Amino acid sequence: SNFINIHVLISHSPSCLNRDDMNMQKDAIFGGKRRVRISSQSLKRAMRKSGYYAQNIGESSLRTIHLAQLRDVLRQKLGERFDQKIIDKTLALLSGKSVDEAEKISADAVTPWVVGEIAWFCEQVAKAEADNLDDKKLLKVLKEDIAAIRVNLQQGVDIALSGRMATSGMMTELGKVDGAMSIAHAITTHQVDSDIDWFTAVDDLQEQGSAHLGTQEFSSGVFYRYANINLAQLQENLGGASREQALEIATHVVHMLATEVPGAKQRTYAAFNPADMVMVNFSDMPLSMANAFEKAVKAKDGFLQPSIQAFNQYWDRVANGYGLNGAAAQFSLTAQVKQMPTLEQLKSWVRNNG
Amino acid sequence: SNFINIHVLISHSPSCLNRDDMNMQKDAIFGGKRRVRISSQSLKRAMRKSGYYAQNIGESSLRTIHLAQLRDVLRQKLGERFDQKIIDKTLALLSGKSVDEAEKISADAVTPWVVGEIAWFCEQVAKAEADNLDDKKLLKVLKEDIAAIRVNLQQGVDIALSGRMATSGMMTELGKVDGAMSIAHAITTHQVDQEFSSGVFYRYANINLAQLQENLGGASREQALEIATHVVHMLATEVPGDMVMVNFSDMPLSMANAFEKAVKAKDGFLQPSIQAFNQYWDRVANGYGLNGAAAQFSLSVKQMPTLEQLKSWVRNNG
Amino acid sequence: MYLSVIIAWSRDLYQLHQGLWHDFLFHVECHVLLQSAQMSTAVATVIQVEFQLQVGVPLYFRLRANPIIKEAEQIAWLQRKLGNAARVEDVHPISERPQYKIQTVCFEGVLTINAPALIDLVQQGIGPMGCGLLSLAPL
């Protein structure tokens, strides 16, 4: 049972949690009908930058493209630990760019960094410098053992979970990370014809009408959040961490997925809703439950109840047809599915490997 | 806890409240049914322009985009305390637009302003002039201390509550304000197309206390709690043109999903609305293990006898 | 009384009433809703009720009218013109776009009933071009 699948039928309220360049709600055609959409990267950053992450998992990675700014940040944070030359050289070797007193140094693309990782590398560079070991041989011997660097990734779990991509520097050979997890886009269970808010900006110094006018798309929705954790990949991405540790990270993710909501336009629409259902299918191969809502769900006393009924029915069907055993454990507000009356009860059920 | 959640479940008429461009009453689809809606900005201007706000919180913010009539205004209000040149230079530097005798100067967008803050900036500009600080170097010096500017924001609370955006001038680095509040759009708990019944509206808001204290220059939790009480009242009463529930918490929480399944009742919506609120509340608090400080004022958790008792209760944390 | 109509025929409002004529109370949906005292032309293609009613019964209502701007004045106008046929129970006055001048206003909402006067008021219309028809519905 390598795969842990998280299904979340989080019901929401009127808002604009995620929009595009036209300031309009992101959407997606599914089942032939328009659904409101929240991009996976939005959920991922929402969780990554949340307080719960900061207190239950740790510090999130520093994703940047500016190497001058990163050079200064590192010179400050690691200045009492290493000499300036060591830090510079380490950054240059890791990025593939030359680090001098230039005000503008750009990496190839946006790259996620971890300060602990860079410190580790700085130690390596120091020792290599002492042994008169050139950067090629250094790259070789470093490439010989990857696990340690992934411990240094124990200090940046968002990377270990959602992967990293390199195109320059030693990172190419040393920092290529394949994401542990796997997270879908957020899709609404039902057809949505979005509403438009006609807004106005009244000038307290204008005799005529408002100084500004406009529109803003918004709507409510019963979304379906899906994610899974690849787990073995997680243990690997953290330096060979224990299965228990991985399950801890996974439970944290479950909680956030049932809890965290993108802070977009919430200051004026406030859709601070909790998940009205969580279902953590412990399993063997990644299995999404989105097809439960392929046939768009029609409202019968709200959208929530028939959404959940659909989810459960389809889950029973897939479980029966593909002989899909393995731990289940739902949770809400099929007998093989242990019912959990509390979220914490579910999380503890997951920590205990189902 | 840091987040205070306000759930003013009001009740009145579903007409002549908020209009769009076609002069129709604003609405929204929730639970697959039509609800009558009042926009958050509507509630916000209604609150910040009402008399209660003027008596308890203070003066509202001057929201404008016309900078010519504005420089006129600050000239004929700060005429004595500062030189003409200094006031002109202050507005210019602050907005980025070069001030003149133009009678037609516009900012990038409609922004809220506070007179006292501008006066403070004028003081710093005076110090600059006497000591001859470069506008760039001056900008550096000012960047060093934002909190002071935020106590100048203590003058204009609606800004500290609902934030301010800037895309030009010195303001860009000194005037960016993240709103402390967060107010949902008011919607009905029931389908608005059996006897006649007045609509019942679920209003939600919350306040991020720490952010409020930060936006006011590092004020105490007490002051923030007081302003929070004022907002509780204004949201519980005011109507543009019954049941209250304040509750402390670690992360913001809205009760709108209680009315996802639209409330149906053949003779009055308020009671099944309150029962829905209670049911969903119990299910949520039990399910997510929340034990924050409650305070429910209803006439049908620490119950409360009146609205003022709840007000004071809030003023004293738990 | 006869409820019924597709007016092509929408040149001017003039041609509308002139068309249906070939008095009665239309009210547009152009497309149209049509109330008449009697029960199909090539200029107007057609696509019977006398309600029982009761006293003190709530009924949704809609009405295009010509109040001759203020919301207060509009609602007061409505309750005045409604007379003692029915107490207004709730109403929203939609300030419609001017027609060709005629400044129509659409009163949509719910009445409580205070009965025959109401019937006569329906079959006679309200106010000074599509205006005047009071549409009623239960709940």
UniProtKB/Swiss-Prot annotation, chain A:
Q: Which residue stretches, if any, does this entry annotate as coiled coil? A: none
Q: Name one GO molecular function term.
A: RNA binding
The record's listing under Pfam families reads: Cas_CT1975
Effect of knocking it out? Loss of resistance to bacteriophage lambda infection, loss of plasmid silencing. Increased levels of 57 nucleotide crRNA and also 2 and 3 spacer-repeat units.
List the induction conditions: Repressed by H-NS, activated by LeuO. Activated by the BaeSR two-component regulatory system, possibly due to envelope stress. Part of the casABCDE-ygbT-ygbF operon.
InterPro entries the record matches: CRISPR-assoc_prot_CT1975
List GO BP terms, alphabetically.
Answer: CRISPR-cas system; defense response to virus
Tell me, what does this protein do in biology? CRISPR (clustered regularly interspaced short palindromic repeat), is an adaptive immune system that provides protection against mobile genetic elements (viruses, transposable elements and conjugative plasmids). CRISPR clusters contain sequences complementary to antecedent mobile elements and target invading nucleic acids. CRISPR clusters are transcribed and processed into CRISPR RNA (crRNA). A component of Cascade, which participates in CRISPR interference, the third stage of CRISPR immunity. Cascade binds both crRNA and in a sequence-specific manner negatively supercoiled dsDNA target. This leads to the formation of an R-loop in which the crRNA binds the target DNA, displacing the noncomplementary strand. Cas3 is recruited to Cascade, nicks target DNA and then unwinds and cleaves the target, leading to DNA degradation and invader neutralization. CasCDE alone is also able to form R-loops.
Name recorded for this polypeptide: CRISPR system Cascade subunit CasC
- Which gene specifies this protein's sequence? casC
Swiss-Prot record, chain B:
GO:BP terms for this protein?
Answer: CRISPR-cas system; defense response to virus
Per its record, what triggers expression of this gene product?
Answer: Repressed by H-NS, activated by LeuO. Activated by the BaeSR two-component regulatory system, possibly due to envelope stress. Part of the casABCDE-ygbT-ygbF operon.
Q: Which GO terms describe its cellular component?
A: protein-containing complex
**Entry's Pfam families?**
Cas_CT1975
Domain of life, per lineage: Bacteria
Q: Does the keyword Glycoprotein apply?
A: no
Effect of deleting the gene = Loss of resistance to bacteriophage lambda infection, loss of plasmid silencing. Increased levels of 57 nucleotide crRNA and also 2 and 3 spacer-repeat units.
Alphabetical list of InterPro entries matching this protein:
CRISPR-assoc_prot_CT1975
Molecular functions (GO terms): DNA/RNA hybrid binding; RNA binding
UniProt keywords (A-Z) are: Antiviral defense, RNA-binding
State the oligomer form and interacting partners.
Part of the Cascade ribonucleoprotein complex, with stoichiometry CasA(1),CasB(2),CasC(6),CasD(1),CasE(1)-crRNA(1). The 6 CasC subunits make a helical stack forming a groove in which the crRNA lies. Interacts directly with all of the Cas subunits. Stable subcomplexes of CasBCDE-crRNA and CasCDE-crRNA also form, both of which are able to bind target dsDNA, and at least CasCDE is able to form R-loops. CasCDE and CasCE complexes have endonuclease activity. Interacts with YgbT (Cas1). Binding of target ssRNA or dsDNA causes a conformational change in the Cascade complex.
Q: What is this protein called?
A: CRISPR system Cascade subunit CasC
| Lineage of the organism | Bacteria, Pseudomonadati, Pseudomonadota, Gammaproteobacteria, Enterobacterales
From Swiss-Prot, chain C:
Keyword Thylakoid in annotation: no
Cross-referenced SMART domains, in alphabetical order? CRISPR_assoc (SM01101)
Disulfides per UniProt: none
Pfam families found in the cross-reference section: CRISPR_assoc
* Single GO molecular function: RNA endonuclease activity
Q: Please tell me one Gene Ontology term that the record gives under cellular component.
A: protein-containing complex
Group of enzyme by EC: hydrolase
EC number(s) per UniProt? 3.1.-.-
Function according to Swiss-Prot or TrEMBL? CRISPR (clustered regularly interspaced short palindromic repeat), is an adaptive immune system that provides protection against mobile genetic elements (viruses, transposable elements and conjugative plasmids). CRISPR clusters contain sequences complementary to antecedent mobile elements and target invading nucleic acids. CRISPR clusters are transcribed and processed into CRISPR RNA (crRNA).
Q: What is this protein called?
A: CRISPR system Cascade subunit CasE
Q: Which organism is it from?
A: Escherichia coli (strain K12)
